[PDB]
Write a protein that binds this ligand. Structure first.
Ligand SMILES: *[C@H](N[C@@H](Cc1c[nH]c2ccccc12)C(=O)O)c1c(COP(=O)(O)O)cnc(C)c1O
Ligand SMILES: Cc1ncc(COP(=O)(O)O)c(/C=N/[C@@H](Cc2c[nH]c3ccccc23)C(=O)O)c1O
Ligand SMILES: C=C(/N=C/c1c(COP(=O)(O)O)cnc(C)c1O)C(=O)O
Ligand SMILES: C=C(/N=C/c1c(COP(=O)(O)O)cnc(C)c1O)C(=O)O
Ligand SMILES: c1ccc2[nH]cnc2c1
Ligand SMILES: c1ccc2[nH]cnc2c1
Ligand SMILES: [K+]
Ligand SMILES: [K+]
Ligand SMILES: [K+]
Ligand SMILES: [K+]
Lengths: 458, 458, 458, 465
């Protein structure tokens, strides 16, 4: 494995502590064996998400301090509008309080727009892979969320350059099956979070957009990790090995009509989101009319002015190639420590997380005994590291658990490679009691979203 | 008019300027004669709103700096849960990114809950007066927003202690006509924003909650300005003459089942909101399930951790009687400066804004040609002060019974010398009020036109 | 009296409170009847000094957050050097932790430079008026500190444009009596703090610099309140009535060879100082050699990088005429309030404080019993406002020409409503002035006794 | 070499950049081959000092935001006074703007105090090793700065537990040859910076104080790195194996009557200093009277209230053993990476810096041609790392001959700021110096282009021969 040095130095620290196993195990009892219900006081290193836990720069805090809190016409709204025009070449912006706020703004509008003239009677969204909140909004609006990720993503340990690509064959089949008139939009998720943070190639984005444009289908770029996608295109696509990251981004967004962004990811923020529309004024007007009751007035969108100011700065810092190389290299370093030790991962590692594959380390625990969770709980009891499950405890009602992933999600510019080593050694050291591991059962199961609030028991 | 001194001193300043007349003339023309389209660079004193423009304390900023940004289990979530138990005696909280996000969490849930066993077939919400976003969410969910403020609120110059009271006669009348099966919730707005920021008496809240409980009707306390309501209760109710502000609050929330709070008002914040439920754990569970797709995870709700930390501190600071006395007295001071110059206003002044009747200043302008807005634009050209129009321009395509101008005062931002500037600007126009002309449309959108309609003189 | 409105609004507040009369009585006895020994918690409105108590801007705080803390070559050192070149046309800077650090850097250097050829055996410094730390460093280096302010400064109620001027005839008399070879330097203090913050005219500074040059005498501009002095030159000198503040400043510094500056005054800071030298590289090198053991390395001088960063921004904001108009106008407003009620003050009021002439307020108490200090302690017990003595106590018994109580006004901290509290407090003691007693030492330090001396009433 | 994980995570970052090889070649020439004259923009990793460059915590910044800026009686002065009582059991405090301001407050007062009754006719100060600013203030007040560090410190490759100890034999001899009337004070420097950030044992501190106490000699603990000293005492003195760091500190200061502190070191600050005095109220009153002209009023002492607020919190954080273990272990890691590559260093590594013995690195460069500076300049040109010399360039010219003052060592100091750099930054530093091993032989000495008379190392210009 290769350690890559920080292209920065530390200016402010935040204390963290590992609770004693007596404290650590008592906290898991009261938590009901669900890490989502643990308080942060009980977590050493927190790998639950890369969302909103990033470390900002001094320039970002300086922007927050001079942020314009005006209810209408904030200086930072116009800055954010100019920045989206610079990065994506899109003429219209609506800030949102975070990613799913942006989805709430835009997806109901696209459905209403598609259902003009009385079409879209069987409305669907098609994505390489809809993220959970994205799919939830698709379905809350009475549509179907169709995921057509490339089959390469399903062969975890076999390298491929672009495991986030659309299955182009399935895109055409679905357009034929449902009809272009029922397809509300195509959602291109970059990077493809649910496939393991795996990149979508520039030629896949291009071909998907050209196919959709030919059928008059609107394309939204789910852009939470668009900079981590742009880096992979520069690193794996020869046509772009000599291009700046901003050049890769500018081309990427020729292949979408709008974007929804969680700025809690690649823009390096702790809160914030964005809608941006290339040139459809009518959809922009309609989305603004939804923004007002759901989020806020159209020039802050549920954000403080200081957070729009931090977004303007964080959008620039997140395109910097030397940071991205360090960021994605640190993720790759953790993955290499793991697979050099014989732990299966989605290879290659994505931009933001290491995905530990199905539990070939706990064979005695089946699907509905939650094998990834028992790993996570022993991993938590042995080290204090909170990870998130992507398996039979997330999927729910039992829909076939094709993968028993464990996601080690890494916040940006927060943890060092020595933190990565601690993570790796903890998980490797679980090859002592991996076999002698008890399964878990529902002591309290909620009707929906159980992985958030279900109380389990060994 | 009596000045009351700040119970604080200034620790940090934000510099503001008066644009030159040429610049103000040019800016307003660029804005199409609609101050909601003005950038903040075009405004000197901004009285558009009291929402999110408040000045925070050093303790609030310090609380933000140590804020826990954890995705799940943030330490500040538990502090906020405790604070809401302390202030209101409510056992459950769901943070929200701001007030209309709190409404979007709670209100659809209250309807679904009422629809059990085929009730709520013609559902309605009843309020002393529903705010704009409050009624919008009621209407968005297929319900009717019914306002039954006391008739005393319509007699603008006649003093009354409680111009935000429920009309009890209309409350039982509406329960009789619609049936308790159709009343999803009663919403107690404290203070009553649309009545001029006018207080609701403790007895009015008590009788309303008694009537709603005898019919099994859920009661939501819209709590954006609950501290100004608590101050007015202590000032004007002999029963609470020697009670602390927190003791007045604690009694207030014995007369509701839940609250929706915009923390951007009285809790002295730039962003933030809150749902709190007294003891109904089923409604709490259901609201959490709506929180996840719409706002975020249930322990941050679309807020940064630093803002939950700022909210915990602001909730305390907003209850301090000496601050409330100064804040509400500053609003009173501006209102007294205007009355003493013969300007009609809603009397007495409410807790956060002065409301001017423009039908008397510009009688030569009918309501359909926006007399109040023509005063606001003249006020702007002469002063750079930005007000907000409550009248035919806000009402929409509709005969408005009043052409108001709201001078909304942010908390701890402007001095009484700023109040003097505002008063003197409006007064100085006394002889030009009759020589100025109304506005017509250059551009008008279909809904909520007051944000983006471009007007033109005649 | 004319209230002038803030050219800014409040962005952050700080709690202050009024201690009870019991608290005040115990605190003053505990402090040895010396308000300098009072804790800040025992003070309501603190008028002890205008030094380091100023409210910074959000831009100043933003500068601190990106401040460069490097030990050598901080980015903000070079920014400060450029700013000094811009404002004063001076080519050399040495930062200092505050004003008396700057004096400790430069004065001993000037003493040894002057006597490098076996002359200056009876070394003296000449000033319109050395402030106390200035005179202390003069005497601490074995020199005499001569003060020759205009006789106009001693006639309190009689207006004059330039009550800080040098007495040019005394300057000539002192040069002849002591000889140019014994005059280490002329210090031009602007504004003249000890005369009441009273301005020096451009033609006075010019005539002093020309007299010094023909005799070969080095001139140091004590620059703590140089921007206030510039404002008065533009206010009262028809030659400069239509110049900018920065043009006035530029012309001022053609009439010195170097400056010492407490940046805790006009540059709007809480800490910081500065030495700047026009073009004498030898004295610059000698001053740097002393800076290293006394203050720090020459590119930070005992300041954090963030404080140099704040100083670059504050040097700009401190020159803004709209700011200076408000600041000096607030001082004038408190003075006019007291003058209208018959309280004798130094008229016209200076830039930073109102100086109450206690020689007339309490004529029964002779100067050796500190009449102004008896009024100050009475003002504190009566109201919790803490002021400072600029008379016999501070002079270190040396005969005093002025017995002042100084109401010193911090920049951008208190409102005119705080000023009304101060004025009404002092006005309300009009009948108790005669019934006041002198004070007597119980512990007297040898150097600058007034800071730590313990006193007892008579 | 063992890497040790941070007992914290990162909350705020500051960008850094590697100037291109040519940028470093131009900048070092503009700086006259003296890195002290390079701007911070010319530097990648800055190892010039560990003073004032530390990374603060969120609690520290929060404390600054609520800091009381009052001129007299700031709430944070009383907090700082209580913290010094809790930590050291000392009853009196005087803030200073930083450590050499604390020295300027107290050392002239100490000489004046001893001078009563005609004593101190030929005054001296005795220390294990006076630091540069400390000796300058001693000498500025007309005293001689005597340094009696244990001879073990000169044997850089030979390990010892307490290379910062006083030499007790030389201490008694110096009390004999000068007389207790001429010893203004003994200055215990913890850790001993000049000796390599090397700890002083508790029994060495105790014996020195007992010797001085029976002879009427005031003892000042130079306390810039007292927490790092305390960690080493717990780490190497079996007596305190079971003690907390605060208990070790509390014992250390039974063996002094006052302290002077640069809070820009172990209290994790960017600015700040402190005089604290155990019980001598007369010394405290005199030091207060000097504080007023030189630093400021006695309740802020030349510090903004926010910095006193940050000091109270940083004083606490700097005592936390889990932080000290990581901090000192990071320094040890850099040293071990260098030792494993055959690079000679002061062994064991001290608390705050790795000291590289440059006499053995560049034999072809004599002491007058600045061997340590030549290594430092090559290290900068090769990697953009800025280090500092503790050798013949800092020493200067002998006042009695006008030629090079012969140095008994020739260190390059890799000074590590607290909580700023990661162990991957340490690898960059080590690899940079290792990668010059074959190039050391072809390194050339340095020659003056501009030389000032005093303190030439801060501002002199040089050129290669
Ligand atoms: C907040 N009301 C604020 C802000 C606001 C919102 N819509 C407005 C239209 C016109 C003028 C001001 C407007 C106000 O200034 O009145 C509020 C809410 C909604 O909270 P949120 O703005 O944080 O989402 C709900 N209920 C009441 C009583 C409010 O005052
Ligand atoms: C033991 C000791 N005492 C006193 C001081 C003086 O404190 P301050 O600098 O706050 O006034 C220092 C400073 N030592 C720093 C700073 C320093 C001074 N001179 C230097 C020469 C070269 C490199 C650094 C420094 C160091 O890096 O060792 C010190 O190490
Ligand atoms: C919540 C995270 N993801 C959010 C996300 C979202 C939702 O963004 P918010 O969490 O900011 O609502 C949308 N689209 C994609 C591809 C996403 O990854 C997460 O990784 O935990
Ligand atoms: C402290 C103030 N004066 C300081 C001062 C000083 C000393 O600056 P410092 O307080 O920053 O040392 C020097 N010169 C002049 C003309 C001054 O007015 C004061 O007026 O309270
Ligand atoms: C994993 C972790 C956090 C999430 N928040 C919303 N969806 C998620 C998936
Ligand atoms: C009066 C008040 C404060 C002072 N600081 C320095 N000199 C002073 C005189
Ligand atoms: K967050
Ligand atoms: K806001
Ligand atoms: K201060
Ligand atoms: K520093």
């Amino acid at each position: 494995a290769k350690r890559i040095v920080e292209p920065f130095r530390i200016k402010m620290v935040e204390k963290i502590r590992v609770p004693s196993r007596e404290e650590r195990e008592a906290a898991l009892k009261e938590a009901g064996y669900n890490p989502f219900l643990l308080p942060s006081s009980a977590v050493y290193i927190d790998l639950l998400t890369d969302s909103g836990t990033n470390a900002m720069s001094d320039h970002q805090w300086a922007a927050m301090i001079t942020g314009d809190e005006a209810y209408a016409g904030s200086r930072n709204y116009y800055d954010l509008k100019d920045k989206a025009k610079e990065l994506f070449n899109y003429d219209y912006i609506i800030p949102a309080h975070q990613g799913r706020g942006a989805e709430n703004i835009l997806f109901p509008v696209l459905l209403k727009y598609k259902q003009k003239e009385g079409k879209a009677k069987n409305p669907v969204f098609i994505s390489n892979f809809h993220f959970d909140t994205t799919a939830a909004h698709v379905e809350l609006n009475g549509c179907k969320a169709i995921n057509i990720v490339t089959e390469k993503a399903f062969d975890s340990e076999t390298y491929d350059d672009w495991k986030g690509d659309f299955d182009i064959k399935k895109l055409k089949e679905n357009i034929a099956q449902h009809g272009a008139d029922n397809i509300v939009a195509i959602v291109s998720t970059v990077t493809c979070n649910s496939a393991g943070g795996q990149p979508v190639s520039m030629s896949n984005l291009k071909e998907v957009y050209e196919i959709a444009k030919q059928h008059g289908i609107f394309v939204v770029m789910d852009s939470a990790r668009f900079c981590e996608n742009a880096y992979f295109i520069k690193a794996r696509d020869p046509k772009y090995k000599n291009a700046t990251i901003k050049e890769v981004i500018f081309d990427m967004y020729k292949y979408a009509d709008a974007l929804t962004m969680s700025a809690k990811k690649d823009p390096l923020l702790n809160i914030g989101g964005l809608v941006a529309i290339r040139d459809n004024e009518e959809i922009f007007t309609l989305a603004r009319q939804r923004c007002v009751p759901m989020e806020g007035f159209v020039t802050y969108g549920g954000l403080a002015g200081r957070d729009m100011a931090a977004m303007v700065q964080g959008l620039e810092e997140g395109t910097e190639e030397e940071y991205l190389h360090y960021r994605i290299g640190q993720v790759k370093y953790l993955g290499d420590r793991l697979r050099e030790a014989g732990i299966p991962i989605q290879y290659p590692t994505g931009g933001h997380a290491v995905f530990v594959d199905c539990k070939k380390l706990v064979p005695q625990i089946p699907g509905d005994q939650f094998p990834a969770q028992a790993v996570i709980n022993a991993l938590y009891l042995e080290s204090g590291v909170r990870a998130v499950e992507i398996g039979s405890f997330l999927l729910g009602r039992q829909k076939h658990a094709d993968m028993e992933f464990m996601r080690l999600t890494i916040a940006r510019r927060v943890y060092t490679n020595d933190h990565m080593d601690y993570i790796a050694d903890a998980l490797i050291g679980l090859k002592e009691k991996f076999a002698t591991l008890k399964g878990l059962e529902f002591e309290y199961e909620p009707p929906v979203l159980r992985h958030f609030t279900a109380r389990l028991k060994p």
